[PDB]
Amino acid sequence: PNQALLRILKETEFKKIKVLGSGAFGTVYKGLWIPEGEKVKIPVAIKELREATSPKANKEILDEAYVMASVDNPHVCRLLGICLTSTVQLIMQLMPFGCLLDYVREHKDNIGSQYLLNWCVQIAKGMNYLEDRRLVHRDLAARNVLVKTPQHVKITDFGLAKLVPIKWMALESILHRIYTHQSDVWSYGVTVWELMTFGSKPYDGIPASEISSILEKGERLPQPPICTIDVYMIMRKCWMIDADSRPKFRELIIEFSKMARDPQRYLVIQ
Ligand SMILES: *CCC(=O)N1CCC(Oc2cc3c(Nc4ccc(Cl)c(Cl)c4F)ncnc3cc2OC)CC1
Numbered sequence: 001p002n003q004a005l006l007r008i009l010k011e012t013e014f015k016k017i018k019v020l021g022s023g024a025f026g027t028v029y030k031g032l033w034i035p036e037g038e039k040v041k042i043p044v045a046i047k048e049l050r051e052a053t054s055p056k057a058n059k060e061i062l063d064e065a066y067v068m069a070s071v072d073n074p075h076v077c078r079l080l081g082i083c084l085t086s087t088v089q090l091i092m093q094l095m096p097f098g099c100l101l102d103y104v105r106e107h108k109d110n111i112g113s114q115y116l117l118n119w120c121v122q123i124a125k126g127m128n129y130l131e132d133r134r135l136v137h138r139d140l141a142a143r144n145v146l147v148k149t150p151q152h153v154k155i156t157d158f159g160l161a162k163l164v165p166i167k168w169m170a171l172e173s174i175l176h177r178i179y180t181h182q183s184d185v186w187s188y189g190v191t192v193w194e195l196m197t198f199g200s201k202p203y204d205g206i207p208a209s210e211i212s213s214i215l216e217k218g219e220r221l222p223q224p225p226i227c228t229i230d231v232y233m234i235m236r237k238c239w240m241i242d243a244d245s246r247p248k249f250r251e252l253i254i255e256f257s258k259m260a261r262d263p264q265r266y267l268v269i270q
Contacts, residue, residue, distance in 0.1 A: 006062075006069035007081035007091075012036070014083070014091060016046055020098075025160070026050045026087070030094060033081070044080065047090040049163065058084055061163060065090075068159045071133070075126030077146060077156040088163065095154065097147030104142070105199035113226075113267035117260040119145075119153055120192055124256060126155040127188060128249035131181045135159075138179050140187040141168045142194035166208040171215050171241060182243035188252065189238025196224035196231070196267075215239075226267050231259065 013036060016029040026049040033042040055061075061084060068079035081091040097103055100119065104111060123145060130137055137158055144157045170186035172178045190202055202221055203211060220239050223232040234255060240246050247255070259266040 001063070001066040002070055003066065006066055006079065007035075009033075009081040009083040009089075009091060010036070011083060011085065014044065014046060014081075014089075020045065024050070031091075033091060043094045043096075044091050045094045047092070047160075049088045049090070051087050055088075056163070061088060064159055064163050067135075071129075071158065073126060073129040074152070075122045075154050076129055076158060077154045079159075090160075092156075093148075095146035095148050095156070097150065099143050100145040100147055100153055101142035101194060101199050103147050103150075104195055108198040111198065111269075113263035113269050114260065115151065116195055116267060117256055117263050118151055119195060120256040121253060121260055122153050123155060123188065123191060124249050124252040127181075127184055128253055130155075130158065131184075131249055136179050136181060137184050137187070139165060139168070140184055140191055141165060142191050142199065145191070164208075166211050167202045170239075170243065171212065172243060174212050174215075180243060181249070182246050185238050185243075185246045185249065185252075188249070189235045189246075190221065192235055192238075193221045193224065196227050196235075215241075226269050228266050228268065231266050 014031055014033045016031045018030045020028045020030050022028070026047060029046045029048070031044055031046045033044045062082070065079055065082045071078045077092055079090060079092060083089040083091070127137065127140065135158065137155065138161055139157055140155065144155065145153050146156045147153055166174060168187045168190045170183040173183045193202060194200065203214065206214065220236060227235070234247065234252070238246050
């Protein structure tokens with residue numbers, strides 16, 4: 001473990017400025033990092049996890065935090081600092097444009113095929129890096145991809161589950177609680193479907209308990225109108241029951257990179 005990669009922050013070093021979101025996990029804020037002895041105010045995001053009733057020990061938390069601090073890839077968010085008190089507070093660079101799911105929903109009219117394909121490439125690059133580190137994300141979804149700038153996105157919330165999204169999970173994860181890189185590939189396929197539909201809800205209106213029976217019967221998310229069969233076939237391959245028959249993230253990089261070269265060929269957008 002490279003301890004230098006992770007800053008242990010003092011409560012005086014950072015300030016919460018505004019609420020960005022809240023959920024069962026806790027609260028996420030926009031704030032400022034003001035390291036002592038420096039002349040800079042750094043915009044950051046601060047995530048405060050809900051106070052644990054039987055928390056993991058501080059040693060265990062730091063061990064996971066070191067892993068999150070060691071991620072070095074342009075398409076995966078890195079843990080910048082941590083503050084451990086009654087709660088766990090995580091500090092990361094601010095991604096000013098928010099989650100990609102909100103972004104595609106707000107910009108449905110103005111999003112072209114090259115943007116969409118470039119995002120697919122960047123997401124697969126991030127996931128491939130995590131696989132290279134032998135790390136399983138387990139919660140990839142459009143809501144967990146953040147927009148640093150419109151053409152630079154990063155996968156977030158890695159390791160947060162350690163420290164249930166049935167509609168993004170591979171069948172084996174639902175039935176047997178098995179999570180692997182190939183189950184991440186299934187989630188990747190759903191994430192791409194979210195983007196191609198400009199933020200539609202997958203299996204809209206269907207209860208979580210019914211999803212597995214839908215998947216067992218061979219039903220899958222429908223082909224988005226803008227996707228050519230070439231793009232849809234890739235998405236469908238991510239949803240095969242046999243996990244090893246799904247594409248590899250390394251393969252997804254190559255395919256979407258090729259399509260990104262001729263976007264109008266692979267996406268038909270008004
Ligand atoms: C859009 C889906 C949704 O409702 N939300 C996701 C984005 C949230 O707004 C922003 C969050 C961040 C984060 N989040 C974050 C994730 C992991 C970790 Cl460890 C940490 Cl410390 C985080 F802060 N990170 C960076 N920038 C942003 C920016 C956001 O909006 C500008 C709201 C809920």
